Amino acid sequence: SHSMRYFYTAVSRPGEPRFIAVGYVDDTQFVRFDSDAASPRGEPRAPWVEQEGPEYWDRETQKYKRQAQADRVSLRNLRGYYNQSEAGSHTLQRMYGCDLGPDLLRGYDQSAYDGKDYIALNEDLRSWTAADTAAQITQRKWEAAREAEQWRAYLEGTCVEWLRRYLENGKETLQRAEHPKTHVTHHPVSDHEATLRCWALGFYPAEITLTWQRDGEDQTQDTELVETRPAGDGTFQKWAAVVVPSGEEQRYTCHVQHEGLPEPLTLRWEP
Amino acid sequence: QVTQNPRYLITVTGKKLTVTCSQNMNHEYMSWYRQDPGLGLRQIYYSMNVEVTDKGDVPEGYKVSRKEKRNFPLILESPSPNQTSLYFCASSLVGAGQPQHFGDGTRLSILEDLNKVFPPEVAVFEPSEAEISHTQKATLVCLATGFFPDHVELSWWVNGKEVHSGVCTDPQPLKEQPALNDSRYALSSRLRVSATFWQNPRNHFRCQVQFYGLSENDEWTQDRAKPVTQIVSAEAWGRAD
Amino acid sequence: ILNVEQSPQSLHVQEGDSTNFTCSFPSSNFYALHWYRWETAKSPEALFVMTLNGDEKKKGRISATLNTKEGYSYLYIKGSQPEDSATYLCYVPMDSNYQLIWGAGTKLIIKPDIQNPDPAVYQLRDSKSSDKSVCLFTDFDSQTNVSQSKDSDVYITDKCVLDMRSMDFKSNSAVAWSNKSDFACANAFNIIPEDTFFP
């Protein structure tokens, strides 16, 4: 229901690697770090963290630069695991965070090398799952360093505590719900068919359900759902379209479900 | 485990040095330490990963390398007398979780002139007859004197076997002339046996002093003998009377 | 804050007794704690590696506990034995292992239970190659201290716990020597334990 997540992306450049990190609370970014800046520094991307002060941001910036130096060695170690040359660019990705239950609900720390899964922290926060044998080298290293109890300490404690703090400092924006603004567009496709596109604009959070119905029966197998896109102002957009015959457009209804709606809306093409 | 070499070394000021330590245990972490009286253990350099090197507390004058995980050499480009110390190489399975396994230690002695290196002179002093009458025991005393540097190992050998029971050697040597920065040392040790054991003429007592000095490859321009690594012993036989 | 205190700095306990010493470190900025034992002429040896609060780790007669909330670790030694004489070092990695701080160390010295002491000073027979006469101060109580020498030519070593395993006998000893002609053994260790035998 509420989550905090960090995303690391380290990419080696044979032509120093570039480490890019971002942090999210639910669907709102609040921090960004880029190792290619003049003087790299953790930077705020939401108002409820700009008010934290220099000691907070100096500590964060230190951790980003420490992680970036570490991901550089990891990129060389991974390159050695797979016997890869130093003329090719490779990608190390990491996503971790915590989910708030009613009173931690679930914690996670998963990683990927060159797009495919590599290693992931199991849900009990005491073991790992390795994808290939190379990741088992990584798992044995982290097990020797007792890295599992380090993450359990973070996910069960620090992650939940600061997630609650962020949700309170920015409850005005984070714990609100923007109802989607909705309309239906009609476009002919043939001399016997037309496309009904159901729009949902400027809603927050991003989780939404757009379904088309024919005579009350869900037409989802025939619906084209587009990927939910960011509007750029903190809200999101999405549309769902279905192709209908030219003499049955008034048999199709659109149904939008969102947290910001008191009840799911039912829409219809209004010619 | 951690194979560190050499255990002892004497070099001239400025002659490049490389103290080697290796491990075939797949250990990610390796570090060099040095221990000095009054200062304790101080880290010189450490390596958390292959081709990763970070300075310790006292890295001045030292260089290291981690081209392959097995090896972590300590290089002294131009050694100076202040680097005369006891060095320890250590390794850990990973740089964070596991404990450190230490090597055997390198007692390095950097001198301005090898003319100050002297082998020890060993003498055994047979037990007092008053001690035999009073305590029914007999204490022998072995004296290793006039040696420099402090690279010696004293051991007692009774009837061809090394003995540790009834033995006690001084933990630190004495400077024969304490007002010098190059004074030769003197060491004492004691072997105490029963009066009956000392009174057996078939019992052979020998204290052995292993001197770690120069090598045969070193240059010697002095008229005296080259103070090479050598063993100097003194012996005493049992006395029925 | 990056400081590791080790208390006591030095301590003497009789063989067979039990002892403990403490390691202090800041509660915050903590990552791990190691205990190393460093016997003379040996190398530092790892005893315990503790990373969790309330950790209790036992190895034989040596046990240790870790209190990360108060920043303390206690090392316990039950039934002290002569082998326990060593410098025990406290190693506290800090700042998520980015700071490797060593303690000053607690130097443990095990004293023998010398009952029925027979303090005496003996003169040992000379060797044909030595110009110096050798004196031996032996069989004195464990709480007797051998102060240095007031004569330059006279050399005196410190006490030396000698253990005769087969007879279950231990004896403290100190040796003095000089090449001077006006050097006697009954006038070489000039606080003797009194009732010292002078043959």
């Binding site: 420490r66 570490a70 | 990963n49 | 998520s96």
Partner: peptide, 11 residues
């Protein structure tokens, strides 16, 4: 806040 990186842990 960010998870504290440990000096020496890599992949």
């Amino acid at each position: 806040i960010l998870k504290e990186p440990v000096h020496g842990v890599y992949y």
